[PDB]
């Protein structure tokens, strides 16, 4: 065996130039697609908020047109999915993990146009869903599409091009190349067996799509929080406790998303019309809340800098929290096309902040600033629910550029994954794939 090992070492890191070049082309396409998607969404939210001025007089007519618009967009989305590609429903990440396990097809000819225009409807309609799902899935399918277009053979090419397209998608959703690479090598990849995935190719693809992102989003940030304060050693324990809180809440939140997934399937029993209409109702409800109390709807990115700065009151924080737990559950569980990463970033921020506030009044001698707890908690829900701490920590880092909070962030995120395990719970994406795969049997 030692002779085989020696042979492999001596042959390590030699990826066929063709796969690398195709990873470059994939990265470029995924990046362009993610830019186009983001712009379309923004344009829709804009138009919608522009109609509210052409009808800004009759208040009831306002609360009416907000709802109608959002309903029509949500409905268009649910329709496009339920009618053409059922698989493009929800996050899309589980499905792609399945494809990495060769247990789920990659019908790109269907998913690409459906996930794109479908998500455009739901996101542009104001629903509490992120761009992460749609872009990562479109990424993967783009990778499959190029694989098929150049009829590339071998597991590696199939596995590599699929994984890079996914990573570049994540990169282009958050402008976070490192988070995009780490996500594949911590969550997406098969967790129980070896794989022929070329990291360097993933790298190339991510770089390419991130550059495509920069070509269209120069001089702006998704989340500008500025430079926060430092964290003394004697304050570290506070970040542990907060992790324990996320730890008890992580599993619970997972139970709810899955439960609500079932409970809502009952309401329409799988009927495409009761489905499309239920979605139209949730969507419209979001467009409605998107005016009355904006902090309860949308992606949540907007309310992050504010909450971190301490501009919200405790009561406002609790309100926003509960309302968002409800709208997030309602939107994701309903099978609507969208991600759950950002909503969880928002929730984590709010919870983290509230905790910081409490801490501040309880420990004046620590000279705390609630925002450090907001940043530490921002990725804590991704650590407790999806259970991919390293990717969350690096994503937050890449978005908030507050590396001096690195230790607290790791301490908080680790506490969450430690407490989430000893309270049971499962990696939400894994639980979902395990669910699709279980429902695929017992149905034979």
């Amino acid at each position, epitope marked *: 065996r030692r002779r085989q090992l020696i042979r492999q070492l001596l042959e390590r890191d030699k990826t066929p130039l063709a796969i690398l070049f195709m990873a470059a082309v994939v990265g470029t396409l995924v990046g362009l697609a993610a830019v186009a998607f983001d712009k379309g969404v923004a344009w829709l939210q804009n138009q919608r908020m522009g109609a509210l001025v052409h009808t800004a007089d009759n208040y009831p007519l306002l609360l009416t047109v907000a709802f109608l618009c959002s309903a029509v967009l949500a409905m268009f989305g649910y329709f496009l999915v339920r009618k053409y590609a059922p698989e493009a429903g929800g996050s899309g990440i589980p499905e792609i993990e399945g494809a990495l396990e060769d247990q789920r097809p990659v019908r790109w000819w269907r998913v690409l146009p459906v996930k794109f225009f479908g998500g455009l409807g739901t996101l542009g309609g104001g629903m509490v869903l992120g761009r992460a799902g749609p872009t990562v899935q479109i990424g993967g399918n783009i990778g499959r599409m190029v694989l098929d277009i150049f009829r590339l053979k071998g597991d590696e090419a199939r596995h590599t091009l699929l994984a890079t397209g996914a990573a570049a998608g994540l990169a282009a959703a958050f402008n976070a190349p490192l988070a995009g690479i780490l996500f594949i090598i911590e969550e997406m990849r098969p967790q129980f067996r070896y794989t022929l995935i070329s990291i360097k190719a993933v790298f190339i693809g991510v770089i390419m799509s991130t550059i495509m992102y920069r070509i269209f989003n120069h001089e702006v940030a998704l989340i500008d929080v500025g430079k926060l*304060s430092d964290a*003394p*050693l*004697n*304050t570290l324990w506070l970040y542990l406790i907060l992790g324990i809180i996320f730890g008890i809440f992580g599993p619970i939140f997972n139970k709810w998303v899955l439960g609500m997934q079932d409970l809502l399937h009952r309401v329409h029993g799988g009927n495409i019309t009761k489905w499309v209409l239920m979605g139209g109702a949730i969507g419209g409800l979001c467009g409605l809340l998107g005016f009355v109390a904006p902090a309860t709807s949308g992606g949540g990115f907007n309310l992050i800098p504010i909450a971190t700065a*301490g501009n919200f009151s405790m009561g406002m924080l609790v309100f926003i929290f509960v309302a968002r737990v409800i709208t997030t559950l309602l939107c994701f569980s309903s099978g609507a096309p969208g991600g759950i990463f950002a909503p969880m970033l928002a929730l984590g921020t709010v919870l983290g902040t509230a905790f910081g506030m409490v801490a*501040v009044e309880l*420990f*004046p*001698q*620590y*000279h705390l*600033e609630a925002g450090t707890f907001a940043i530490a908690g921002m990725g804590a829900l991704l650590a407790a629910s999806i259970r991919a701490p390293l990717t969350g920590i690096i994503l937050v880092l890449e978005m908030t550029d507050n590396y001096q909070l690195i230790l607290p962030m790791i301490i908080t995120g680790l506490g969450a994954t430690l407490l989430a395990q000893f309270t049971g719970g499962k990696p939400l994406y894994s639980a979902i794939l395990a669910r699709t795969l279980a429902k695929q049997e017992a149905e034979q």
Partner: antibody
Amino acid sequence: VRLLESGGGLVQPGGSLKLSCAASGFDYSRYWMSWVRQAPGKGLKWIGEINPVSSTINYTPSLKDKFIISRDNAKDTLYLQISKVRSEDTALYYCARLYYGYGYWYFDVWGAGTTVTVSS
Amino acid sequence: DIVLTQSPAIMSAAPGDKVTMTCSASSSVSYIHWYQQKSGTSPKRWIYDTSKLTSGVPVRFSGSGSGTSYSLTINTMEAEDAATYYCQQWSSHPQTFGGGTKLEILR
């Protein structure tokens, strides 16, 4: 690193005066500033502290607007307004930059201080 | 708020001698600090976190203690050690200071 506080002097009882503290030789912004005073022949006594963005300002257990601590990061200057001055307020006033080791904060660097005299 | 009482208000010691001053706390404290104040001049952070020396403080200077009793010590005292030493604790809010200890050069 220098802390030069001025404004002190003779003030009539019940009157009010504003002490200033000019900071130089370091980034004034990432630092918490604090005021402390020493009455003639007596011990030291903390007056209060103020964080970088002025979002937090704490005082000694002394009532209401008796003390108003402010700061101007644009001029790297710290301010302390005292009102209804009485004899107990006659003392040497020191501004101090705050910092910490393990986290149990200390008074990093002190200034030469300004003398305040309350008399008619 | 915590009351720090320094055991010796005034003490005299000839150069070259182990001098030790106490800082008792009314309650429990941790990682106390020490400041040196020479007549006519501003206080200088000398020892912090109970035993760490500030950059520039001679090795003859040491500090120790725990729970509710701390102490500053000077091994083979010099002539430039004469000053007033104040202990301070921010382990509890608001911070407080000791009554101070006056170190005079016996001769």
